[PDB]
Nucleic acid binder design. Structure first.
Length: 1316
RNA sequence: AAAAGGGCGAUCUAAUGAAGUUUUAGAGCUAGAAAUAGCAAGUUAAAAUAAGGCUAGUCCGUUAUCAACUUGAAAAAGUGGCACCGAGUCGGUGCUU
DNA sequence: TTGATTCTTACAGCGGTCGACCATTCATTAGATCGCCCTTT
DNA sequence: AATGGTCGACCGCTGTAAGAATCAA
């Protein structure tokens, strides 16, 4: 028995745990070791860290589900088309679909003829010669009227249905609107027709290039408006161009309107909104919008269809045929130019599949960018290729028909081509003329997002309510699926429930009841003190609501005191400084319906609540129209349209029963009525909730009947990695309490922690910002990926190559002389993100180190900052922090706040994990039903321990080992315990419990909190070493800190060579193998793609994921003699379920015999094996091992490396040699690799002339060979050394397998040598 | 003090588009016994896209969870003595069952 | 002497380490939750 | 990106069977 505390450091991949006593010492105990070896007890130091792989998210699984459902629904649409064409195709070919389905099978396995389309070689070659691509057949079936073969018609319709197109456009993209210049001219003409006085016209503009550019839509709008001098952005023509581009302009100032008239062509309500505009402006303007609409139809198709739609009714097919013909002609010309000028490279461009070129781009499957980059120098070093470079610069040299650009193809063009083919070929076939709507619906149908999967109770993701338990088809969807109820289930499935009434839903934030509740709760507290004479009469509040809250939207206090406190009651008040509780939806519905008596009717309030809930639920217009038809008879048709135009979003916090349905028995009144009137004492909502006399609190506690630990962890808001770390943390705490014999700690001080993907995201952001900024910086200075990791160059390309503190330009390759400056002082806020860093020539450009850059900088750079913000190059937070100088800058309050943020946590995830720890530890209540808090759950911040290390020479290098996690946990425990002992008045900011305005006081208090740990003070007179050696607590005889003994204990603890580093063994869960489908080969490693497909004939997968390995000792045959061998086999995820419940069967199926079913051992990943000489290996897979030994470098060398990497140490030179010797000894002891060690030694002896700083910085990197885990690569002065992978597991078969507990204190060893 | 409005971030769900890959179809010509050499043409299409599963749906199948043993049916639970000297991954020495 | 036997001993087959090479992507739409940093009212 | 599957080349091990004795009868 003792009084101990626990220290925890929570991370996304690690959980450090440590145990301290009242003397800040770490106890050591002997633990029993089970198994077969003679070791029955091992001593350990009760401090360590649990390592674990990061927890991944469900985003990948969701993507897989969506892809699988998309594929299956496409296959089902094809099957619907086949079911339609079956009976008619039987009269033409009985084996047509049979040959189409068997196209994948080889002729050896093909039951019918090879050619699927027809069944003969002659007509097959004839069709492929006459129609080379399928777009030829598309255009032939669209344009020509001759009766074609039913097989070709089915092929065209199937290619249209299989790849329909994006449903991002609502309505009908009219193909007749194809040219941008003609439609822009028509828009200018109809604009001039409207106003003859000031006709805005410009013939020198070219809309086809300005409006159809690759820039941002707003940038194209700006470029077009800049070309016309008479027009402006706020003008009506600017809004017309915005509508043509789809920027959702507003026509308030253009038509002298008093309301907002926002029109968006992509939205569904547009027409209605348009009509509303046509109800306020003259109808003669309507044609203008029509023209604008036409422009919006031609500005998109300009990229989709490149041919005149009047030439043929298949514009996309014609564009594809033009692609094919241009490809053919350019390929012929290129072959001629190669055979005429440089034939020596012909075999390299038209015959090699490995290298790039026409043979690698077609047959080798190379990229189009690689193709262009490979041909660019060849076209530059030629004569008759000066014109082909014009097409290669626009990425249109040798274009295929199925490229990525085809993503921009909407389903409307394919629907039009299908309708054309159907109308042409229906005059010959009866079923085609009779079943046109069927195929049109097959290609048009799209399951709504608010319906989900079409399941009958076998899908945990589905929510659709069926009107009839029948098979759902694209034709009877609206009759089998209740779309309204499905959408309501979709929305209510994801909304929150009332925190006080868990079995009740929450009304929307725009509910009239919620607004009444807020107004009444806000109005209950009012001074209203006249001369001489807070009563808050219920009738008076009702009169105020009827006269002010129901007449004006925002009730301001100056108008309040003059309307009721002066006019109603004659007088000549300080409750609330506006009220922040307006009846906004009340006035909205009033302006919509123009009937105050209907709103003030108590009987009609239920209908109003249902209307508001319906407006909040659905977003689609058809849903709200179907759900508002029940109230159609109540209002006028115009009022009905205006109410269907209104749309609300957002949800409140309280249920409907908590606002008005609840009523105390003894009080005999509802809670809303209590807020309206409560006698002389007008109580509040919180007063009504937490009152010992109110029956409310008891019923609220009774309604909360209920769960598990994992369920509570999953409900927490945060990344899954943090939640996994938290779960491992509570497991570690449970096991630690178990080690202490079910004794609870006195304190638990817990502290949490705050790439090609990042490079790609940075490249995307820079490209988008420069495109919307219209700068040529990406063209002048070519930027490549993975180079933006450098902060200087990243900030250069983010600031368009110019300073943000002055108007000068920045020079490439001079960035080392330029400096990065923090927008807020690093002394105040310790933020090193891009939202706080600015690349400038000199720091003196900033106004002062005290505060934000002065307003003299803002008044000059605000325009540039706004241009950067509008280009999405800087966050709005950075704009605010830069321009804060105009708003007074930083005062003394926000400085104290920034200083306190660095010490106090104020993080909700930390609060929740502290609540979890407190609810798990403190579970006893006393006589007065008060919680007995035995364990203080202290929440500490990383900055505190980091400053402690930096101030007291307790440096730690992360690259050395994993001990730093345990050490940080120990330091957190020590610092938290000492802080609570020194300053108990601060327990409200650390210990989890119920617990200019002296701004400089708080600023200075939170600045030197830890100065009582120091051993000296620096007064203006000098360095006075008169610091109390025994720091104690005021009015408490307890000693808090001892400078003579406690530091020694901390140094000894950090110098301990035994730390419990444990790697969590986990079964690999995920995909079956690599997703790539490799071609066929003569190897058993190819996994079959289908049960009826052969890998050597069709290819398949290559690298399966090994999980749940099995050590087995059995006899195998090899004159077919049986030899008894022991080996571990790697089960794959695909065959994991089959291996379960069938050990002997699955093992004999692979070739094993006489398998000892009782000796089969299950081994996950990272399983620990001690071999010899203290070497430990972790089973990485079936045939790979990982370093499992931790190097314990002495703290002297750690501090030396830290001080020499920074340079201020000037430490001993031979320390480098001593560290090299220790690394070499550790390597020779546990690292089986010796060639890498010899290479390291040679490189070190070669680079001895380098300074001590660089030598230490590279010795830090050298520790990779001695780190725990998978071997990796490392560089020592540009001398990279490859990893040495342990490609065998034969030694592990006789090793000592160690099953370690969560903390590693309870071990079980098994000698595997006694199994063969 | 509070609301509101933005702006970034962590997640979760549903509906879609385009590519990618694989097998097959798209007859390759000439010379030559052959090995192979010389030419021509190449852009497209079908089918699959986790093996598959029963619960038979136009459903589900890559998230979370996992040291050992003993139970339970799963979840989950239970199972391992304490001080003192030291410290290279923990070793001893005392007590106590 | 002669087949069999008994080593026996040098030559082809086996199943271990170095050294690369590779690893399914882009893009929309519609919602719902929590969490933090700001300004504005 | 990471770290494990996979193929190619190499390569020491190894066990194996074809001489080389080696008895015995």
């Amino acid at each position: 028995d003792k009084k101990y505390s626990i220290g925890l450091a929570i991370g996304t991949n690690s959980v450090g745990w440590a145990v301290i006593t009242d003397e800040y010492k770490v106890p050591s105990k002997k633990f029993k070791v089970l198994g077969n070896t003679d070791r029955h007890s091992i001593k350990k130091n009760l401090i360590g860290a649990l390592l674990f792989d990061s927890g991944e998210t469900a985003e990948a699984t969701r993507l897989k589900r969506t892809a699988r459902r998309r594929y299956t629904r496409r296959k089902n649409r094809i099957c619907y088309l086949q079911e339609i064409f079956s009976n008619e195709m039987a009269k033409v070919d009985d084996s047509f679909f049979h040959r189409l389905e068997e196209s994948f099978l080889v002729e050896e396995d093909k039951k019918h003829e090879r050619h699927p389309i027809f069944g003969n070689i002659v007509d097959e070659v004839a069709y492929h010669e006459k129609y080379p691509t399928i777009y030829h057949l598309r255009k032939k079936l669209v344009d020509s009227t001759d009766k074609a073969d039913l097989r070709l018609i089915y092929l065209a319709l199937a290619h249209m249905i299989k790849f329909r197109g994006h449903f991002l456009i609502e309505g009908d993209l009219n193909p007749d609107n194809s040219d941008v210049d003609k439609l822009f001219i028509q828009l200018v003409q109809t604009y001039n027709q409207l106003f003859e006085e000031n006709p805005i016209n410009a013939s020198g503009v070219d809309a086809k290039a300005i409006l159809s550019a690759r820039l941002s839509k707003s940038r194209r709008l700006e470029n077009l408006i800049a070309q016309l001098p008479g027009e402006k952005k706020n003008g009506l023509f600017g809004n017309l161009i915005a509508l043509s581009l789809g920027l959702t302009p507003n026509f308030k100032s253009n038509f002298d309107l008093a309301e907002d008239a926002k029109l968006q062509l992509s939205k569904d309500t547009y027409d209605d909104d348009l009509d509303n505009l046509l109800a306020q402006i003259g109808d003669q303007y309507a044609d203008l919008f029509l023209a604008a609409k036409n422009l919006s139809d031609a500005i998109l198709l300009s990229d989709i269809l490149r041919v005149n739609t009047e030439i043929t009714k298949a514009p996309l097919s014609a564009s594809m045929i033009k692609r094919y013909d241009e490809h053919h002609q350019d390929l012929t010309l290129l072959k001629a130019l190669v055979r005429q000028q440089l034939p020596e490279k012909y075999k390299e461009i038209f015959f090699d599949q490995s290298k790039n070129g026409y043979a690698g781009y077609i047959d080798g499957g190379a990229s189009q960018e690689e193709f262009y980059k490979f041909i660019k120098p060849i076209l530059e070093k030629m004569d008759g290729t000066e014109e082909l470079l014009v097409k290669l610069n626009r990425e249109d040299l040798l274009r295929k028909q199925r490229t990525f650009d085809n993503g921009s193809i909407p389903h409307q063009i394919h629907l039009g081509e299908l309708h054309a083919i159907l109308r042409r070929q229906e005059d010959f076939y009866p079923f085609l003329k009779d079943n046109r709507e069927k195929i049109e619906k097959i290609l048009t149908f799209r399951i709504p997002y608010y319906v989900g999967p079409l399941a009958r109770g076998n899908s945990r993701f589905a929510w659709m309510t069926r009107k009839s338990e029948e098979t759902i088809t694209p034709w009877n969807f609206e009759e089998v699926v209740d779309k309204g109820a499905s959408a309501q289930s979709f929305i209510e499935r994801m909304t929150n429930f009332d925190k006080n009434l868990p079995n009740e839903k929450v009304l929307p934030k725009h509910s009239l009841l919620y607004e009444y509740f807020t107004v009444y709760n806000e109005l209950t507290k009012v001074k209203y003190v006249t001369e001489g004479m807070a009563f808050l009469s219920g009738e008076q509040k009702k009169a105020i609501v009827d006269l002010l809250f129901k007449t004006n939207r925002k009730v301001t206090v100056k108008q309040l005191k003059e309307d009721y406190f002066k006019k109603i009651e004659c007088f000549d008040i300080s409750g609330v400084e506006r009220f922040n509780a307006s009846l906004g939806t009340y006035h909205d519905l009033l302006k919509i319906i123009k009937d105050k008596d209907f709103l003030d009717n108590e009987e009609n309030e239920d209908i109003l609540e249902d209307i508001v809930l319906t407006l909040t639920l659905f977003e689609d217009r058809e849903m709200i129209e179907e759900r508002l038809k029940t109230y159609a008879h109540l209002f006028d048709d115009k009022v009905m349209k205006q109410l269907k135009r209104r749309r609300y979003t957002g949800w409140g916090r309280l249920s409907r029963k908590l606002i008005n349905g609840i009523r105390d028995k003894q009080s005999g009144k509802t809670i809303l009525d209590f807020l309206k009137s409560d006698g002389f004492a007008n109580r509040n909502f919180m007063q009504l909730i937490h009152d010992d006399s109110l029956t409310f609190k008891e019923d609220i506690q009774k309604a909360q009947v209920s769960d598990s630990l994992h369920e509570h962890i999953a409900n927490l808001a945060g990344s899954p990695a943090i939640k996994k770390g938290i779960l491992q943390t509570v497991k570690v705490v449970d096991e630690l309490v178990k080690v202490m014999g079910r004794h609870k700690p006195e304190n638990i001080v817990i502290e949490m922690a705050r790439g090609q993907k990042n490079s790609r995201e940075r490249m995307k952001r820079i490209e988008e910002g420069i495109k919307e900024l219209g700068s040529q910086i990406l063209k002048e200075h070519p930027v490549e990926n993975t180079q933006l990791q450098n902060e200087k160059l990243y900030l250069y390309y983010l600031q368009n190559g110019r300073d943000m503190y002055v108007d000068q330009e920045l020079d490439i390759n001079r960035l080392s002389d330029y400096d990065v400056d923090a927008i807020v002082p690093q002394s105040f806020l310790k933020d090193d993100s891009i939202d706080n860093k600015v690349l400038t020539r000199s720091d003196k450009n900033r106004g002062k180190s005290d505060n934000v850059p002065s307003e003299e900088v803002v008044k000059k750079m605000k325009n540039y900052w706004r241009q950067l913000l509008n280009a999405k190059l800087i966050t709005q937070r950075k704009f605010d922090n830069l321009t804060k100088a105009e708003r007074g800058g930083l005062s003394e309050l926000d400085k104290a706040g920034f200083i306190k943020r660095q010490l106090v946590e104020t993080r909700q995830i930390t609060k929740h994990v502290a609540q979890i720890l407190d609810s798990r530890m403190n579970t006893k209540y006393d006589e007065n039903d008060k919680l007995i808090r035995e364990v203080k759950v202290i929440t500490l911040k990383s900055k505190l321990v980091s400053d402690f290390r930096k101030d007291f020479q307790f440096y730690k290098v992360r690259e050395i080992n994993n001990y730093h996690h345990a050490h940080d946990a120990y330091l957190n425990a020590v610092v938290g315990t000492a802080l609570i002992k020194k300053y108990p008045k601060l327990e409200s900011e650390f210990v989890y419990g119920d617990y200019i305005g002296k701004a400089t006081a708080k600023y200075f208090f939170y600045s030197n909190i830890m100065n009582f740990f120091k051993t000296e003070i620096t007064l203006a007179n000098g360095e006075i070493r008169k610091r109390p050696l025994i720091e104690t607590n005021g009015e408490t005889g307890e000693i808090v800190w001892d400078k003579g003994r406690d530091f020694a204990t901390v140094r000894k603890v950090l110098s301990m060579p035994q730390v419990n580093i444990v790697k969590k063994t986990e079964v690999q869960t995920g995909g079956f193998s690599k997703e790539s489908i490799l071609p066929k080969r003569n190897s058993d490693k190819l996994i079959a793609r289908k049960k009826d497909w052969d890998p050597k004939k069709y290819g398949g997968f290559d690298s399966p994921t090994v999980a749940y390995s099995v050590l087995v000792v059995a006899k195998v045959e090899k004159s077919k003699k049986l030899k008894s061998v022991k080996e571990l086999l790697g089960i794959t995820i695909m065959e994991r379920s089959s291996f379960e419940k069938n050990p002997i069967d699955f093992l004999e199926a692979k070739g094993y015999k006489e398998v000892k079913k009782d000796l089969i051992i299950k081994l996950p990943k990272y399983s620990l094996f001690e071999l010899e000489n203290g070497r430990k290996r972790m089973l990485a897979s079936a045939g790979e091992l990982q370093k499992g030994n931790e190097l314990a470098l002495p703290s002297k060398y750690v501090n030396f490396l830290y001080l020499a990497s920074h340079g201020s140490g000037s430490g001993s030179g031979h320390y480098l040699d001593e560290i090299i010797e220790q690394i070499s000894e550790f390597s020779k002891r546990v690292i089986l690799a010796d060639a890498n060690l010899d290479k390291v030694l040679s490189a070190y002896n070669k680079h001895r002339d380098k300074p001590i700083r660089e030598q230490a910085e590279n010795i830090i990197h050298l520790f990779t060979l001695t780190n725990l885990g998978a071997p990796a690569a490392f560089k020592y002065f540009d001398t990279t050394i490859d990893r040495k992978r342990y490609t065998s597991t034969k030694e592990v078969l006789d090793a000592t397998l160690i099953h370690q507990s969560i903390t590693g204190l309870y071990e079980t060893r098994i000698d595997l040598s006694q199994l063969g």
